[PDB]
């Protein structure tokens, strides 16, 4: 390889031999593109003129009242498509075309990677097929309609837990047979090298912008940046530029689901153990005898029993801290942002917000400047949430 596939002991390329050539080809294209001014120009043009970068950095007006916390929201919910997922898809799509691929394969849970893949495909003239767990098709339904309207083929996966990992399985199986004409547009900073690297580099602008914005507004770096972690793309995109800024805390939030103790969560980084799956060596939710355990989260976008290798590494060296947030905590954070800031966040993003609220509430007289990555908008979640709030009497 041209680049290092490992982050400490995590990462690698654990795929059937038949896929190695495809990965090597991708890595090569990526290295070349990165040095290609023409590529850089095109990417930047799409980000700016089509996707709507740079996204705003909004200062919360009400939710920090009565505390010494200053909270800013990196508005990825404002990106065309409705989430951070759009950034990297544009980059990958340009790569696909450069490699002469005419078809796209993708997996999605929240349907945000799915939507982004479909829009990029429509624009660049690629044929798109998307694998989505049957459970997700149901709970993130609005996104299914969007995908279909843009001409993408949506394939429901009924096997296993009928969620992200199951869609991931199907996508890899598909690619194994179609690598010649199809590019696998992996949705997160996980999987085999070079994906973790590529996705980070194509999401890097999140943190780069945040730094410039916060410095402009506050004249100093944040005390901490907080982001949810499902696969690890939005977090790493936010974290990347701050890694060398030691004074800046990096907090990743994994889904606590029903609660860690229940076993129904999606927090492998802190509660799993190293394993080999989905082409990588990383922390995983697994049984005693090495079978992959099914994750659980109210949030389709975080419902994945593993995590990107760079996160596992950052944790191990203690550069970044990882915590968990339960379903109930995320719901409250969702409700709160809606009613007090007039922003409807994705349930995924609500996990990161819930943690920031905890930080402020627990130590109200502690002076701190926080930045939360508002990874997406909650349009996709409204039917789901409404029916919960209702069943409780909060709506």
């Amino acid at each position: 390889t041209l680049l290092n596939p490992y982050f400490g002991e995590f990462g690698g390329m654990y795929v059937p031999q038949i896929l190695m050539p495809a990965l090597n080809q991708l890595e090569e294209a990526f290295v070349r593109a990165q040095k290609d001014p023409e590529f850089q120009a095109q990417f930047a043009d799409l980000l700016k003129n089509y996707a709507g970068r740079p996204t705003a950095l909004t200062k919360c007006q009400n939710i920090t009242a009565g505390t010494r916390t200053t909270l800013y929201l990196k508005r990825e919910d404002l990106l065309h498509g409705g989430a951070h997922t759009t950034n990297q898809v544009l980059g990958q799509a340009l790569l696909a075309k450069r490699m002469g691929k005419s078809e796209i394969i993708a997996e999605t849970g929240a349907g945000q990677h799915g939507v982004a893949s479909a829009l990029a495909s429509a624009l660049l003239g690629l044929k798109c097929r998307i694998y989505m767990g049957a459970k997700d098709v149901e709970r993130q339904s609005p996104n299914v309609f969007r995908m279909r309207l843009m001409g993408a083929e949506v394939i429901p996966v009924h096997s296993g837990s009928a969620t992200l990992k199951d869609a991931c399985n199907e996508a890899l199986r598909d690619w194994s047979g179609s690598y010649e004409t199809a590019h696998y547009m992996l949705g997160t900073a996980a999987g085999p090298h070079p994906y973790p690297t590529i996705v980070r580099e194509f999401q890097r602008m999140i943190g780069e912008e945040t730094k410039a914005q916060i410095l402009d507004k506050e004249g100093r770096l944040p005390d901490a940046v907080i982001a949810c972690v499902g696969g690890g793309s939005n977090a790493i995109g936010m974290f990347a530029d701050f890694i060398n800024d030691t004074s800046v805390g990096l907090i990743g939030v994994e889904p606590g689901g029903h609660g860690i103790e229940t076993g129904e969560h999606g927090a492998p980084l802190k509660h799993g153990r190293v394993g080999i799956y989905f082409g990588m060596k990383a922390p995983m939710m697994q049984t005693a005898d090495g079978q992959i355990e099914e994750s659980y989260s109210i949030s389709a976008g975080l419902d994945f029993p593993s995590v990107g290798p760079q996160h596992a590494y950052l944790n191990s060296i203690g550069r970044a801290d990882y915590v968990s947030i339960t379903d109930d905590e995320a719901l409250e954070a969702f409700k709160t942002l809606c009613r007090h800031e007039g922003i409807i966040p994705a349930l995924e993003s609500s996990h990161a917000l819930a943690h920031a609220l905890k930080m402020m509430r627990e130590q109200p007289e502690k002076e701190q400047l926080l930045v939360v990555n508002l990874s997406g908008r909650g349009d996709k979640d409204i039917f789901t949430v409404h029916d919960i709030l209702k069943a409780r009497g909060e709506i």
């Binding site: 654990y14 038949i18 080999i276």
Partner: protein, 255 residues
């Protein structure tokens, strides 16, 4: 390792090709599985390739996915598989036995520990589906240390460097995935382990076709599983059907 050498040695002496059926351990049940395996051997299988049920078989098609589910339903675990392997070996001392694994099952309780266990039960080779030659170091080293043949797949899109690597690192046999005749030549030239055709082997003609082409034999990757699947309701018919199939496939290998 040795059991493979002995096989190829003798096979050669009769100008016969090897016929190796694939089956999932514990499908559709422990006892029935054992019965099936006995039948394959009796019907003329030269060697065996056995799968250990894995939760997320990302390199397998629906036939094998289904097999895994049946096994799981039957309450089969990796521990039970090792128990079965012992019983098999007790009955059939010379037949070469190869395992088809996923890396997580090997990695789980330590790589070295897994291979030591294989050695103990009398397994001859291990193929790890999701470990490319590029990442194989620790796996092939532990195998060698425990007198286990590390099996590697030679994909249709193999290049010269791949051929050379596989020739160097592999033992027992080379798992070929279908220029066919050119691949054979190069492998031979590189002194790779005897090549077995793994792609498309579902009927006898394909067997003979492979041997004729220069292969040392053929692996039937899912054809057997299909028979199990279709005869679930009648184990009686199942065994009869398997017997007829294997017998026919083996016959095709005498050329």
């Amino acid at each position: 390792m040795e059991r493979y050498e002995n096989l190829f040695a003798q096979l050669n002496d009769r100008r016969e090709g090897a016929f190796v059926p694939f089956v999932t351990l514990g499908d559709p049940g422990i006892e029935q599985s054992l019965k099936i395996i006995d039948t394959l051997i009796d019907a003329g299988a030269d060697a065996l390739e056995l799968g250990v049920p894995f939760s997320d078989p990302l390199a397998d098609g629906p036939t094998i996915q289904n097999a895994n589910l049946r096994a799981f339903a039957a309450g089969v675990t990796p521990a039970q598989c090792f128990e079965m392997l012992a019983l098999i070996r007790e009955k059939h001392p010379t037949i070469p036995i190869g395992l088809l694994m996923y890396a997580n099952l090997v990695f789980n309780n330590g790589i070295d520990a897994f291979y030591a266990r294989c050695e103990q039960v009398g397994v001859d080779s291990v193929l790890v589906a999701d470990v490319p030659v590029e990442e194989s170091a620790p796996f092939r080293q532990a195998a060698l240390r425990h007198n286990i043949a590390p099996i590697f797949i030679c994909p249709p899109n193999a290049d010269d460097d791949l051929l050379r690597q596989v020739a160097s690192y592999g033992r027992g046999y080379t798992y070929l995935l279908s220029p066919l005749h050119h691949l054979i030549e190069k492998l031979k030239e590189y002194h790779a382990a005897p090549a077995l055709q793994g792609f498309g082997i579902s009927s006898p003609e394909q067997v003979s076709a492979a041997v004729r082409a220069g292969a040392a034999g053929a692996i039937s990757g899912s054809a057997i599983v299909k028979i199990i699947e279709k005869n679930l309701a009648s184990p009686k018919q199942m065994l009869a059907e398997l017997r007829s199939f294997v017998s026919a496939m083996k016959a095709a290998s005498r050329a």
